[PDB]
Symmetry: C3
Subunit: 532 residues, 3 copies
C-alpha cells in the first residue's frame, strides 16, 4: 500500500521506508519535477511550469543529476553522502527534480515544518540525491525537501545583458520554492513555515535568496553553512562579457554579438557543452599565467532580476528579507578537502616558507582577491609569528580559510543583526569517523564535517561512536528547533545565545559551550587591510 | 469558370469533373490544409489551426502523402485504388490535407449529407488521394471528404507520459472533423449530418472516435469496415516505453529520459526518421526470435486525452457515442492480400499440417494474442475436422481471420446494441474483377474487396460486368441511405434488418439476403478460450 | 557627462560630438535595437518588439550591418560614405538597429522635425552606419535617424503564399518607424512631424511605404531620390515560386512544399545562406543564357499584408498616403557607377554600334523589361540620331537611365499630383569632387551624387570648393524646409515651384533654376511603346 499524493500537476506514487526506533515509516518521493525540462530553446531561460500528467507518476527512482563533470560529481557525492553506500547517478539536462521525505501520516491532517536543502559544489557539481533525509525527518518530525538546480554553463552562463542575463540556477531554486508553497500541504508539510538551508554554494544560494526580492514570502527561516554571498569567488562582479566570449570561442561559436553567442550555444548538444566545460577546466587553480585572468567558475551576477545591486550595497541599504538567520562555519574550512581533493593544491609537501607562502597566496587570487601589495602584509600577519614551517603551513591554511569563509560570515551576521532580524552563529569543531582515510587526522572541523551531524549519518552509516550519535542528535534537534521556532534553543540542550552586540555563538563539537566575539580580530584586520 | 469557395482561412480554387450519365459536374478540391504543418518543434504535438492565406489558393493538385515506406504505400494504393490509373504520390511531413468531392450547385443553397473517409494501412502507410470520391458523390448526392493523418513514428510515437502522449494521427482526424464542422457548409455539405467511415486501420480509427470524448458532436453516424478498436494488433496496451527506447536507440538517440528522447527525435530529419522506420521493419512477421517481443507497428495508446480507459472498459461502462453504427467484415479477411502481399506469410506452399499450423499460430502472436498453451486447442478446433492439408490451410486462414476481425466486430456490435444505439451488420462475400491476377481465384470476399463497390470502381475502371455494376449501385445506395437516415433501408433494395437480440445481418454479394447470428459460435468459443 | 536617454525598453548611453561653427554639440546614439534579433525560428517572420534591458545600454559603437556580400557592401559604403574615412563593419543576422543624431538640448524640451533615412543597395547590400548625420543635424536643427533592415534572402525570401509571404525588410522599416513614433520624443524629436527619405532601393522603399496601409500615420512627408516602386527591377511581379525553388536547390534544400522549403532554410546557418547568396550571383548581368530567365535580385512582392495590389493598380485607385512628396532624379543615373562599378557592364570599350546596342539592350532585360520586338524601335529612337559611335554610347546610357529612373519617377509624381497631394521634383546635375578617380570626369549627375550634398559631405570631408559648400548648404536647407513645412521653399533660396499641371521642377547644380515639363517626351514615347 504505497502512499499516493495528489499534486496540482498530477498524482505521484511514493515509497515507505522504516528507520530503526521509529514505528511510523517515512514516505519517500524520488524525482518529482517542479519545472519543465530546459531542453533546446529553453536553455538559458527562466524555468517554466511543469506540464500536468494524466496517470499516477511513479516516484520511486532517483532522478538524474544536472549535467556536469562526472568524475568530480561522483567524488563529491562520495565525500558528502550520509548513506552507507554511494548511489550512482546519470547526467542529464533534464534535472529539475526534487526528493521529499515526510514522516507525516498522509491519511490524517499534518502541518509539519518544511526544511528545503540546497546542495553545494561551487555551482558546478553536486546532486540532490546525494543527501538522504530519512534520519532527520524520522528523528525531528519535519518535511525534508532536497532540490536540484542547473549548474555550470547551463545554470550560470551570462552575456551581461538582456539576451542572457544569467542566474538560471537561482531561478530554478525560486521555482522549487514556489512549488513547495503550492504543493507541500499535500505531503503533510506546512507552507506557512518553510526553512531553507544549504552548505558551501548552497549557503551562498541561501544568502542570495535572502537578498533577492523574487524570493519574498517563499521561506521563513534560513541557515547558511560555510557559505555566504559576500564570498567573492562565487559572486561574479565586474564585466561578465570576456568570460562569455571565452566560453563561446571554446565551444566554437562566433562572438559577433551577445544574441549571436546565445543562439549558437543553444544549438550545441549536451555532449559538446560538457566537452567545453571540461576544456575550460573550472574549479582548478592555475599554476601558470596571470592569476587575475583565471576564472575559477561561473556564478552569480548582478543581472537586474534576481539581484538588483551587489550584496554589499543591498546589505548597506538593509534591503533584504529580515527572517531568523543562522550563519556558521567549520573550524578548519581549508584544512584538507578543498585544497587537496577538490582543487589539487600543491601544499602536499607539508612545509611552507614565507616566499612560497606569498607566491601561493598570489596564485590563489581567484579564491581570495588580495592585491599583490597586500600579500606580504597578510603573509607576515599570519605566518610571521612562528618560525617552524610545519606550523606555518597550517597558518597559511587558516589565512585562506578566514578570508574565504570566516570574515564574510561574521560580516553578514553583523549586518543581519543590525537590520533587526534574529541572528545565530556557530563554529563546528569535530572530526567525523566517516571521514576519508586520506585525511591526516590532525584536521578537526574540515569543510563539510557538520553535514554528517545535520543529516543523521551515524544512524544510516556503520561504526559511529556514542559521542558521535549524541552530537548528531543534538545538532538535528537544534536545526529542527530553529526550523519550527526560528530559535535553536530547547529543553535538554546547551544554551545557544543569540548573536547580538555581545556577539555570542555556539562552539559545536565534543564539548558544546557558548563563546563570544567570533572572528572579531580577523574581521577587523581584513577589513582594514582591504580598505588600503 | 472553375468553382471558388471561401473557407474561414481563405478562398480555394476547385475543378469541375463530369461523370457519365450525370448532367451536373462534380466540384473537386484537392489538397485543402486543415492544420498547420507539423514540422520541427511541432513534431509529436497536437495539430494546430492553419494560418490563413491572402489570395485564392489553387486546389487542383493532389497533396503529398504522409512520409512512410514508399514501396509499401505505392503497393497499397495500387491494390486499393478505384481509379483506372494509379496516381504517383510524394512523401512529406507536411501531409495534413483533405480532398473534397461535392455534387452540389455551389451557386445555390445545398445541405447534403457529408461522408468523411479514413483510409487504412495499419496506421503505417496509406494516402487519402488513393480514393476517388467522384462516382459515389455523383451517384448518391453526398459530399465526400477524404482526409490524411500522421502515420508511423510521426503519428503514433509515445513515451507513455506527458512528454509524448501519442495518438497524433487520431488528433489529426479530430482536427479534420472540426474543420468539416466549420467549413463544410460552404461546399454544399450539411455539418449537422456527418458520417465517418473507414476500412481496416480506418475502421479502427472510426471505432476509436466512437469511444473518444474529444469527438463529441463531430459526427452523427459511423461505419466500420473490417476493423474495430477491439482489434488487439492496433491498440497498444501495457508498457509503451520499451518500444520508445528501441525506436530511440535505432534512431541513435539517448534513452536517459522521456524528455531527452522526445527532444532528440525532434532534431532528426525526415530522411533519418524514415531510415529508422525502415530499420524497425514494421508490418513484417518475425520468423525468428520470441514472438511476444516482436512489435508489428505503432498504434493507439491509452494516453488519457483521446482514450481515458481501454476500449473494453469503456464498452463495459457504455461510455461511448450512441450514434447509429454499421460494422461489417468480409467473408475471407485473411484469404490472400494481408498474408501474401502485405506481410509476406510463408503460407504459399499450399499445404499446412497440424504441427506447422501450431508453430505458425505461435509465430503470429503479434497479430493474434494467443498464449502458447491455448495454441493446440485453437488449432484442433479449426484444423481438426478435416484430414486433407489443402482444406486445413484454408481453415488456418479462417482461424486467423476470425480472431483478427470477426469476433471483435460482433462483440463491438453487441455492446453497441446493448447500449441502446442502432446497430447494423453485414458480411461482404464477392470477388471483384478488378482484383490482382495473383489471387488464386478461389478467394471470395478478400480483405478490402468491398471498397470497389463502396467507391464505385465499376464506373471509373474498365471491364466491369452487369452484376458488378448492380452490386456497386446497391452498396453505394445503402451507404448513402445510412449516411442520410442512419438506417440503410430504402425502396428498391433488399431488406437489411437491424442488429438486435435476433442478430440479423446482411450477406452482401451476388445474392444479397438477410441472415441471423453472425459468428455466434466463433465468438462463444474464442470468448471462453481466452478466459482460460 | 555623456547624454543618457530613457527609452521605453530601457536607458541608452550616448556621445557628444562637436562640429565646427556650432557651439552646441550633437548627441549621437549608435546601435539602438528597435526589434528582436531575427535568429533561428524568427528567420522569415515579421519583426517582434525588443526585450527590455535592465541597466543603461552603451550606445557608442556602430552596429553590425545585415549579412550580405562583404566585398560589395564595403565597396558601396566606400563609394557612398560622406565621412572622411570609411568605417569597417561586421556582418550579422542581428542587424535591426538604428543610429540617432539629435542636436537638441536633451535637458530642455525640444520638438524638432525627424528625418528618417533608408539606405540603398538594391535591397541586397548597404548599411545605415555608412551615412553620418552630424553635418545635417548640426546645420538644420533636425533629428536624423538612420535605420537598418534585412537584406537579400534574409529580408525578401518568398514562396508566394502564407508560409513565407516575403517583404521582411519593409516590415522592419515599418517597425523602425513605429519605434520612432514611440521613442523619438525622448531624443528631442517631434513624432507628429516625421519625414522618410531614401535613395535607390531606399527611394523604392519610401514609395512602397507611401503605397502601403501598414505605414499609416508613421510619417508626414516623403522624399524619393533616384527610386520609386514603379521601377520594375525591384518589385517582383508574376509567379514568385520558381525563384524560391532555385534558391532552395542552391542551398541544398528539398522543394516538395513551401513549408518544407521554409523549414529547411530556417535550419541553415548564416554561413550557408551567405554561400548560397554568393552562388546565386545577384546584382550581376548574365552575359549568357536567356535574359528573361535571369533574376537580378530579390525584392518586393505583392504579399497581401504590406502591398495588397500592384503599385500601378494602387496608384490608379489613388489608394496611397497623400502626404507632401518629393521625387527627383540625377541627370545621368546610368553614367558610371551602376554599369561599371556595381554590375560590371561591358561598355568599357567606349564605342557602341547599333547591333551591339540592340544586343546589350536585350541582355539588359532584367533591368529594363523591353520585349525583343521593341528593342529595335527603342534603339533607333535614341541611337539613331547620331552617326558617331562615341555619342551613341552616351545615348544608350541615357536610354537605360530613362527607363530605369526617369519615366517611372515622373509618372509617380504625376499620379501623386492628380490625387491632390503636394508634389515637388528636382533634377540634380553636378559632379562632386569627392568622386572616385575612376570616373571619366565627363559624368555630371552620376547615380548617388546628390548624397554628398544632402548629408553635408563638404564639411566632414576634405578639399571641398566654395561652390560645393554653397550647394551643400542650399540642398540641406531645402530638405530641412521640406521636412518641417512640407514645402522646400524658404528665404534666401531660389524659388522651387510646385509640381502641378505646369510640371515645374528644380534643376539643382552649380546654376540652380526652375524648369518645366521634366521628361515629358520620354514619358510619352515609353508609355506608347510599352502599350504595344
Ligand atoms: C562603451 O563602449 C565604448 C567602446 O565602444 C567604451 O569606450 C572604449 O573603452 C575602452 C575601455 O575603457 C577604451 O580602451 C581603453 O583605453 C585607455 C587609453 O588608451 C586604456 O588606458 C585602457 O586600458 C583601455 O585600453 C577605449 O579607448 C574606449 N573607446 C573606444 C573607441 O573603444 C566606453 O568606455 C563604454 N562606456 C561605458 C562602458 O560606460
Amino acid at each position: 500500500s504505497p502512499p499516493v499524493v495528489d499534486t496540482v500537476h498530477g498524482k505521484v506514487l511514493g515509497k515507505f521506508v522504516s528507520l530503526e526506533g521509529f514505528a511510523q515509516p517515512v514516505a519517500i518521493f524520488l524525482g518529482i519535477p517542479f519545472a519543465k525540462p530546459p531542453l533546446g530553446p529553453l536553455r538559458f531561460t527562466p524555468p517554466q511550469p511543469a506540464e500536468p500528467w494524466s496517470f499516477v507518476k511513479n516516484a520511486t527512482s532517483y532522478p538524474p543529476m544536472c549535467t556536469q563533470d562526472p568524475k568530480a560529481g561522483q567524488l563529491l557525492s562520495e565525500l558528502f553522502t550520509n548513506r552507507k553506500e554511494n548511489i550512482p547517478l546519470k547526467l542529464s539536462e533534464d534535472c529539475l527534480y526534487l526528493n521529499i521525505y515526510t514522516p507525516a501520516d498522509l491519511t490524517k491532517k499534518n502541518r509539519l515544518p518544511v526544511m528545503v536543502w540546497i546542495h553545494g559544489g561551487g555551482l558546478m557539481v553536486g546532486a540532490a540525491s546525494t543527501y538522504d533525509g530519512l534520519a532527520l525527518a524520522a528523528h525531528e518530525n519535519v518535511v525534508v525537501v532536497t532540490i536540484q538546480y542547473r549548474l555550470g554553463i547551463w545554470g550560470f552562463f551570462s552575456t551581461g545583458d538582456e539576451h542572457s542575463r544569467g542566474n538560471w540556477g537561482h531561478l530554478d531554486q525560486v521555482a522549487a520554492l514556489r512549488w513547495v508553497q503550492d504543493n507541500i500541504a499535500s505531503f503533510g508539510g506546512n507552507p506557512g513555515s518553510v526553512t531553507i538551508f544549504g552548505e558551501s554554494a548552497g549557503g551562498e544560494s541561501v544568502s542570495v535568496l535572502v537578498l533577492s526580492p523574487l524570493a519574498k514570502n517563499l521561506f521563513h527561516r534560513a541557515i547558511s553553512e560555510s557559505g555566504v554571498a559576500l564570498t567573492s569567488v562565487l559572486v561574479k562582479k565586474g564585466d561578465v562579457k570576456p568570460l562569455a566570449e571565452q566560453i563561446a570561442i571554446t565551444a566554437g561559436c562566433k562572438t559577433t554579438t551577445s544574441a549571436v553567442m546565445v543562439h549558437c550555444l543553444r544549438q550545441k548538444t549536451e555532449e559538446e557543452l560538457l566537452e567545453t566545460t571540461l576544456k575550460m577546466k573550472f574549479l582548478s587553480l592555475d599554476l601558470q599565467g596571470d592569476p587575475r585572468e583565471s576564472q575559477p567558475l561561473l556564478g552569480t551576477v548582478i543581472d537586474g532580476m534576481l539581484l538588483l545591486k551587489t550584496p554589499e550595497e543591498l546589505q548597506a541599504e538593509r534591503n533584504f528579507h529580515t527572517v531568523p538567520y543562522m550563519v556558521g562555519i567549520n573550524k578548519q574550512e581549508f584544512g584538507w578537502l578543498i585544497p587537496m581533493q577538490l582543487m589539487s593544491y600543491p601544499l602536499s609537501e607539508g612545509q611552507l616558507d614565507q616566499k612560497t607562502a606569498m607566491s601561493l597566496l598570489w596564485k590563489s587570487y581567484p579564491l581570495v582577491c588580495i592585491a599583490k601589495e597586500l600579500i606580504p602584509e597578510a603573509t607576515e600577519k599570519y605566518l610571521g609569528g612562528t618560525d617552524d614551517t610545519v606550523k606555518k603551513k597550517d597558518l597559511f591554511l587558516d589565512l585562506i580559510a578566514d578570508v574565504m569563509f570566516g570574515v564574510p560570515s561574521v560580516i553578514v551576521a553583523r549586518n543581519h543583526r543590525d537590520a533587526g532580524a534574529p541572528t545565530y552563529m556557530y563554529e563546528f569543531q569535530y572530526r567525523p569517523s566517516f571521514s576519508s582515510d586520506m585525511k591526516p587526522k590532525t584536521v578537526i572541523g574540515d569543510h563539510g564535517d557538520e553535514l554528517f551531524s545535520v543529516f543523521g549519518a551515524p544512524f544510516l552509516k556503520e561504526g559511529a561512536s556514542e559521542e558521535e550519535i549524541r552530537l548528531s542528535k543534538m545538532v538535528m534537534k537544534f536545526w529542527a528547533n530553529f526550523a519550527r521556532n526560528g530559535n535553536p534553543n530547547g529543553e535538554g540542550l546547551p544554551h545557544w545565545p543569540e548573536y547580538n552586540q555581545k556577539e555570542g555563538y555556539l562552539q559545536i563539537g565534543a564539548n558544546t559551550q557558548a563563546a563570544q566575539k567570533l572572528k572579531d580580530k580577523e574581521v577587523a584586520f581584513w577589513t582594514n587591510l582591504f580598505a588600503k
